[PDB]
Amino acid sequence: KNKCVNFNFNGLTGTGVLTESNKKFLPFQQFGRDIADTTDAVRDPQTL
Amino acid sequence: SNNLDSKVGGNYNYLYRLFRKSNLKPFERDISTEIYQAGSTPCNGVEG
């Protein structure tokens, strides 16, 4: 967390900084996208 | 799979549809055993 790193969560490739935000993910929502339809937040598959 | 699936005398277990009344849509499995017509001639049962 708090480091510029390359992410890959089930094909969701990208680069960014990981942190805990106020996003309230529902039980069925897997990952969110920004206004550009680009993945801006995901959920850890191993442990929720 | 000539040495695996085929057998002496002819392996006639695999089937295929010669024709249908019209072309089917993609990603569609059809297991119907009805006799389909090539043209507009109504057959109504027996072959010919």
Binding site: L26, F28 | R29
Partner: protein
Amino acid sequence: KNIDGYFKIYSKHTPINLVRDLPQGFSALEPLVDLPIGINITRFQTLLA
């Protein structure tokens, strides 16, 4: 609904105080499960107690 053989099932449970036909309101339904059966559905029924 059945989209490309993937049978979608949504669910939403909420309390009400209703004495007439369907409530005139709004409520978002969430997905419950996804059953990839892979068949064409044309009819349906329901069970009652």
